[PDB]
C-alpha cells in the first residue's frame, strides 16, 4: 500500500495472507468469507508468463496476523488448503479478465476477535454503494514504494497498512490505460491534483477492497486487488476484480460443485 | 512511453535483475528494462541479496518444555516451536504424536 | 430477515459458518466503536451525490 | 578557530558542516568517515541545559564546502540524516565525558576531489602518534574571536579556517581546569609565554582533530572538538573527545546492524 | 570567575541578552554574568540583530529556465534554485518531479 | 612498514565505501603536493624538546 497508514489491531479481521512454503515468502493478500473458504486473485496461483502454477502443496494461509513476519502465537492461525478453484474463463494472456479464485481450507477455522468473515454483496448493496466518488478501503502488507529503494527509505511495511480510495467513473478508467478493460473490473484512486494519494502495490494482490454499509453497518467485499500501471502514479488508477459481477460462479462452486 | 509494459499484476515473485537489484516480480523488472535499462535482464530468482532474518519464533521464548513430535520426525520443545517451524524451518509441519519422536 | 437481520445467501451445509453475522467486527461494530478513518467513507457518501 | 589561517581548497575533504533548518544556521562541524557515515560531538544534537534535543528533521548536512555561507553549486553536497546515534554513557551534566554521536546519511554521497573520508586510528597509530608535543590539525567555521563583533576583525570567518596545535601532557591538562577530566578526552594547545597562540572556538565542536601518519602518509582523526574555557585563554587548553578509545562503540554501532 | 562557569561546549546556539549583545550560546551568556554583568539575562533566542541577507544563491544566476517541482509543492526555475532553497527559503526541499507543480 | 595494504577495520556492507582509500586527499597526497603547513606537523615528530 502506498501513502497508507498503520492499521489498528483487528481492523480487517477477514484479512488472510498467502505465504509461499519455500522460499518462505509473502505472496498475496486474500480474504476470509466463511469459516472454510478464502477469496484471492487467480493470478496469485496461476500465471503462466512467470511459470507460476501453484498447487495445494505449494503454500499455506496465515490468518489473524498484523505483523508482517513474526509468528504471533496468541492470535495467528496457520492453515493448509484442500482444493483450489480458479475461474474457467480467467484471462491472464490479455487483461487478467475474471481474475478470481476460491481456496478451501483443509479444516474449518475457529473464529475470534481477530478472525471474522466479510460479507459478499447483494443486488441491493452492490447497486446503492457502487457509485463513483464513494470511498472503499484496501489493506495489505505489500510494498510502500514502487521504486525498490536504493536511496530514500524502506519499502516493506512492519504491520498491516490501510488506505481509503474513491471509486472512479468507468470512462476515466478506460481513458487512463491503454489496456482493454472489462465489466469484470473497476478502478479507484484519486485524480491528479485532488489533494490525496494512495494505491495498492506489489504484494497486495488478492487483498480485499471493502465498503461499510450505512444500512446495516456490515462490511461488504466489493473488489479484489488485481493489477495496475506502477503504484501511486499520476493519471493512473488501480484495477480491482468486480466481485458482484462474479458472485454466481462463487455460488456455483460453493453450493453445488464444491461441498 | 504510455506505460503499456508497466501494467503489472500486483503480486510478489521477486527476481534478481542484472540491474544489481531485487525486482518485486518479473513484470516490474521488464517495465524498468524499458523505462530505463534496455539491456536489463533477469539473472536469478529470489532477492539479489538475502533478506535480513529476524527472530520469527521469538514469541516462543521462555515457553515450558513439553516436547512434541512432528510429521518431519523432529522433536520440538513445545507446540509454539512446532507451529513456528511450519512457516519457517519446516513448512507445513504438523503434530504427529506427543512427547519425543520415539525413533 | 432470518434471525439476525442479514440475508444468508449461501448454503450453510457447504459454505460453513460465518455468513449470518459477517461484516461485524468483534472489536468495533459489536462494541459500538469507530475505527480512526471510517469517518471518510460515510463522508464520501454525502459528497458523491 | 582563533589565531588560525584560511584553509586551501580541498585541504580537508572530510570536513562536514551541520546546518540547522530553522533558523538556517551553522551548528557545529563534523567529519565524513565513509560514503554514508558522519562523526560529531554528541553535544551538538543533545544538550538538555539548553533545551537542545534534535531529531533527524531538525538539521541537514553540508559536505564539500569552503565558504560557510554561499551555496557552492560546483562542489557542495547537501544531505539529510537517516539515523542519529548518541553514545549512551554521554555525560552532559558533569564534564562532557564520552561526547560523541554518529549520523547516518539518508543516501550515500558521491566522493570527489572535495569530498573524501578521513581514517579512524588503530592500535599502532594511536600508540605511535598520541605523544605530548606532537601536532595535530583542527579546522572549522567557528568564531575567530571570543565575544560577538568587537573590532575590524569580524567574528565569523568567510572561509574554512586551519590551525595546527600540540598535544599536551595529561598532568598539565588536569592542572588547567577545575573540572574532572577523564580518559575519554585529551587537551591541546600552547603553554603561556611560548608566544604561539591558537584554539578551537564556538561553531567548531564536532570538527575533527587530525594527524598525518609518517608511516603510510594518511590522515587520521584522533579527536573531536568538544569544550574549553573561553577561546585561546592563557593557561587554558582545549578539550577533544578521545576517538581511538571509543572505537569499540563506533564498531558496535556500524557493524552490529546489517546481517 | 573560576572555571565551571566558563567551561563551555564550543557549539553555536546564539541568543540575545539583556545587554543587546549576541552570545554564542547560553553557556557563553552565563559565563559573562559571573564576570562583570550580574544583570545579564537572556531576552530571546537568535542574534539581537538579523544577519546580512547574503546572496547565497548567486551561483545559480543566469541559469536556463527548466522548472522542477519540489516536495514543498513550489515550482523552481531549475535545480540550482531547488538545491539552493534546501538551505534557505525552503529548508530541506527535494526534487519531487520535473516540470511545474501539478497542484 | 606494512606488507599487503592499510588497515580496513569495518565491514563494507554496513560501513559503506571509503575506508581503503581514506586519509589520502585527492588534491594533495594523490598528486604529490603538500599543503602550506604540513612540514610544521612532521617537524614536531622529530623536535622532541
UniProtKB/Swiss-Prot annotation, chains B, E:
* Superkingdom to which the source organism belongs: Eukaryota
Q: Which locations, inside or outside the cell, does it occupy? A: Secreted
- Single Gene Ontology MF annotation: serine-type endopeptidase inhibitor activity
Q: Does the keyword Metal-binding apply?
A: no
Site residues, Reactive bond: 10-11
Against PROSITE patterns, the record matches this protein to:
KAZAL_1, KAZAL_2
Could you tell me the keywords of this UniProt record?
Disulfide bond, Protease inhibitor, Repeat, Secreted, Serine protease inhibitor
This chain belongs to the protein called: Thrombin inhibitor rhodniin
**Can you name the source organism?**
Rhodnius prolixus (Triatomid bug)
UniProtKB/Swiss-Prot annotation, chains C, F:
Superkingdom of the source? Eukaryota
| Name used for this protein in its record | Thrombin light chain
Source organism per entry reads Bos taurus
Complete-protein stretch covered: 339 to 366 of 625
Amino acid at each position: 500500500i502506498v501513502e497508507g497508514q498503520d492499521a489498528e489491531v483487528g481492523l480487517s479481521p477477514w484479512q488472510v495472507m498467502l505465504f509461499r512454503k519455500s522460499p518462505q515468502e509473502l505472496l498475496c493478500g486474500a480474504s476470509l468469507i466463511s469459516d472454510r473458504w478464502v477469496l484471492t486473485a487467480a493470478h496469485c496461483l496461476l500465471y503462466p508468463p512467470w511459470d507460476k502454477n501453484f498447487t495445494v502443496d505449494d503454500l499455506l494461509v496465515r490468518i489473524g496476523k498484523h505483523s508482517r513476519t513474526r509468528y504471533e502465537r496468541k492470535v495467528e492461525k496457520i492453515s493448509m488448503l484442500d482444493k483450489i478453484y480458479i475461474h474457467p474463463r480467467y484471462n491472464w494472456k490479455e487483461n487478467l479478465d475474471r481474475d478470481i479464485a476460491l481456496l478451501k481450507l483443509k479444516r474449518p477455522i475457529e473464529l475470534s476477535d481477530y478472525i471474522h468473515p466479510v460479507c459478499l454483496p447483494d443486488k441491493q448493496t452492490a447497486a446503492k454503494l457502487l457509485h463513483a466518488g464513494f470511498k472503499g478501503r484496501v489493506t495489505g502488507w505489500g510494498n510502500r514504494r514502487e521504486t525498490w529503494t536504493t536511496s530514500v527509505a524502506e519499502v516493506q511495511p512492519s504491520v498491516l497498512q490501510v488506505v481509503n480510495l474513491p471509486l472512479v467513473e468507468r470512462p476515466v478508467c478506460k481513458a487512463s490505460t491503454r489496456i482493454r478493460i472489462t465489466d469484470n473490473m473497476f478502478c479507484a484512486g484519486y485524480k491528479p491534483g485532488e489533494g490525496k494519494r494512495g494505491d495498492a502495490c506489489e504484494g497486495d494482490s488478492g487483498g480485499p477492497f471493502v465498503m461499510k454499509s450505512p444500512y446495516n453497518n456490515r462490511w461488504y467485499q466489493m473488489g479484489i486487488v488485481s493489477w495496475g500501471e506502477g503504484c501511486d502514479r499520476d493519471g493512473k488508477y488501480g484495477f480491482y476484480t468486480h466481485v458482484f459481477r462474479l458472485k454466481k460462479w462463487i455460488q456455483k462452486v460453493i453450493d453445488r460443485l464444491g461441498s | 512511453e504510455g506505460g503499456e509494459p508497466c501494467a503489472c499484476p500486483h503480486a510478489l515473485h521477486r527476481v534478481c535483475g542484472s540491474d544489481g537489484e531485487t525486482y518485486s516480480n518479473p513484470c516490474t523488472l521488464n517495465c524498468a528494462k524499458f523505462n530505463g535499462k534496455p539491456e536489463l535482464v533477469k539473472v536469478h530468482d529470489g532477492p539479489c541479496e538475502p533478506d535480513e532474518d529476524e527472530d520469527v519464533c521469538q514469541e516462543c521464548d521462555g515457553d515450558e518444555y513439553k516436547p512434541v513430535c512432528g510429521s518431519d520426525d523432529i522433536t520440538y520443545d513445545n507446540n509454539c516451536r512446532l507451529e513456528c517451524a511450519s512457516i519457517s524451518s519446516s513448512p507445513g509441519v504438523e503434530l504427529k504424536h506427543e512427547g519425543p519422536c520415539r525413533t | 430477515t432470518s434471525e439476525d437481520h442479514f440475508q444468508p445467501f449461501f448454503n450453510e451445509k457447504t459454505f460453513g459458518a460465518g455468513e449470518a453475522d459477517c461484516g461485524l467486527r468483534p472489536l468495533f461494530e459489536k462494541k459500538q466503536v469507530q475505527d480512526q478513518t471510517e469517518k471518510e467513507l460515510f463522508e464520501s457518501y454525502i459528497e458523491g451525490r
